[PDB]
Automatic annotation (TrEMBL), chain A:
Protein name: APL1B
Keywords attached to this entry: Coiled coil, Leucine-rich repeat, Repeat, Signal
Superkingdom as given in the UniProt entry: Eukaryota
Entire protein: shown range: 27 to 364 of 555
Entry keyword Acyltransferase: no
Disulfide cross-links: C295-C325, C313-C324
Record bears the keyword Ligase: no
UniProtKB/TrEMBL annotation, chain B:
Superkingdom field: Eukaryota
Shown stretch of the complete protein: 25 to 364 of 555
Sorted UniProt keywords: Coiled coil, Leucine-rich repeat, Repeat, Signal
Lineage: Eukaryota, Metazoa, Ecdysozoa, Arthropoda, Hexapoda
Gene from which the chain derives: APL1B
Disulfide cross-links: C303-C337, C325-C336
Ribonucleoprotein as UniProt keyword: no
Protein name in UniProt: APL1B
Length: 328, 340
């Protein structure tokens, strides 16, 4: 997000004047000649976003050796020419989000050994081997058709949400910190042992039926864990956020103070009957609705430790602080 | 917006325009706020492109610094209104595009000073008010995909697209220049307003709420070639007058038509006539060789009438067929009909 002022315009204009930054965004470009950039050796940043480009021609980037940033998001690309980045070894950021790409062949980023930010969200990708790009720092491949996620050695933030991923592979990665995998087809979490630096992990809307606590024993930094909308049935356990909402949970045990640093705990839409929570000053937010509470257990929870409520209780159950519960 | 080829020539011409700071491309730069004095040191700008940003407001005097402005493109931003005086100091403006914002209204004084404004693109906003008739310089106008209920047509617009609104009233001065009028997907129930547009060549009234078409409304048409009125609620048509000799396309499909009456030679110059998806039982044509495509399926044909129709029309002109027929109907050259 930029603020347009005489100062920021002047800087933009300076970069244009020298042809170091070329803005071709939003010009309804549909076709590009092979030699369009034949005499544009000065170009370091090339912006071609929000056009209607169907194809990139052979050798299109053969004469732009200083290229570091290339933005081609919001076009109609479905594949890439041979050796597209062969002559752009300085490339640090590349976006082709919102195209129609189907595969990224494995040789694509072989010469781009400084590529650190790669944006490929909202394509039709069935194959991209990110593990072959060990320079990656931030990556987004969300909203594609990937079934296998290969994670490179030192990526720090990776969003692969909204795919059909059921396999995660790649070398141990102590730097991966934010991992977004919501809306996928994951049924196991053993791969979590390879990512000891994780702070935020979202595994919501997957096909998890159990979450075994020994997959988390190498975690040095984990603060936020989202596992809503899976099919978890029971849980028997630096964490600040824990989302267990919308599962099939019959019980959740925690032994015991390891829930004391929690500020956000979501238990709503499960089948929980009892739940213990010590006097944790402070817990910021707690959801309990749409469960099967025993009234005694529910009461004790309000003495020690709400942001939701029940509307209609079923037979045998009555409202108690806005939540349904059954008497002993 | 028309598409371009990026060639050494077109890139050279672009770079030359950029070099002189006569064309400024700020498209796609995630611009959110703009300071009133943003263009204080850029008085040379004639074409200003700020499409595909996230601009929420324009300062009222932001364009005082660009008095040579002829083209302004602000498509795909987040504007909900224009402030008073926004174009007061831009008299040379000829094209203004602001499609795909959230504009609710254009106030009547917005274009007072822009007396050369010819091309106006406001499609895909939420407009409930824009008085285009105040802007007589308009030549090409697009206000499609809005919430307009009244359409004031300016005096000399040549092409106007107001499709996908909720228009039930058309008004404004007699306009003999209007050639292409797109009004499909609206709420029209009458066509008396057609009398004020004698230059019309192509008119699309499909997906409206027309139950009748009064043939007299077309008596002043000098050059009408294509008339689309599909997907209305038409039940009966009687086209009796002098034919429109220029008319070559007539789309009456997907109505509720029981008949289309006409004098013997009415349709002799049509090339394309679409009657499919109605309730037509009998229909007549003369033996004209001009017809290229005729659609007849999904009706309620009397076999004798249908067979009389094939005897007069050339074999290849029928380009549709029924698949299965209801009880007591059978296929005749691929079309269902019932014997008398
Ligand atoms: C990865 O890319 C996706 C898709 O562009 C991002 O999702 C969009 O995020 C913005 C801002 O949060 C939302 O306004 C959009 O609605 C989202 N788009 C879609 C299609 O859902 C996502 O934010 C990116 N991931 C990261 C970590 O930045
Ligand atoms: C008026 O503007 C609209 C923009 O909505 C144009 O509609 C687009 O037409 C193109 C084909 O030319 C299609 O690719 C898009 O799907 C249409 N857009 C939408 C939102 O449906 C329309 O063509 C313009 N009218 C004229 C006569 O040019
Ligand atoms: Cl980022
Ligand atoms: Cl004004
Ligand atoms: Na890690």
């Amino acid at each position: 997000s930029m603020h347009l002022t005489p100062f920021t315009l002047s800087a933009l204009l300076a970069s244009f004047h020298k042809v170091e930054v070329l803005n071709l965004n939003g010009l309804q470009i549909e076709e590009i000649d092979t030699n369009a950039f034949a005499y544009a050796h000065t170009i370091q940043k090339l912006y071609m976003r929000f056009n209607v480009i169907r194809y990139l021609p052979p050798h299109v980037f053969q004469n732009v050796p200083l290229l570091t940033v290339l933005m081609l998001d919001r076009n109609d690309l479905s594949s890439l020419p041979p050796g597209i980045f062969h002559n752009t070894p300085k490339l640090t950021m590349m976006s082709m989000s919102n195209n129609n790409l189907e595969r990224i062949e494995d040789d694509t980023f072989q010469a781009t050994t400084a590529l650190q930010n790669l944006q490929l969200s909202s394509n039709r990708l069935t194959h991209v081997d990110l593990a072959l790009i060990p320079s990656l720092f931030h990556v987004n491949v969300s909203y594609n058709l990937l079934s296998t996620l290969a994670i490179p050695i030192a990526v720090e933030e990776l969003d692969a949400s909204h795919n059909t991923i059921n396999v995660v592979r790649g070398p141990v990665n102590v730097e991966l910190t934010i991992l977004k995998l919501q809306h996928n087809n994951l049924t196991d979490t053993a791969w979590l042992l390879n990512y000891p630096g994780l702070v935020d992990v979202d595994l919501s809307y997957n096909q998890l039926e159990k979450i075994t606590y020994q997959h988390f024993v190498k975690m040095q930094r984990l603060e936020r864990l989202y596992v809503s909308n899976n099919r978890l049935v029971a849980l028997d356990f630096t964490l600040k956020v824990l989302d267990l909402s919308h599962n099939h949970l019959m019980w959740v045990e925690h032994n015991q103070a390891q829930f004391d640093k929690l500020q956000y705990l979501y238990l709503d839409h499960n089948s929980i009957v009892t739940f213990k929570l010590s006097t944790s000053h402070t817990l910021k937010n707690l959801t309990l609705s749409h469960n099967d509470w025993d009234c005694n257990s529910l009461r004790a929870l309000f003495r020690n430790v709400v942001h939701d409520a029940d509307q209609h209780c079923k037979i045998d159950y009555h409202l108690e602080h806005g939540l349904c519960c059954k008497e002993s």
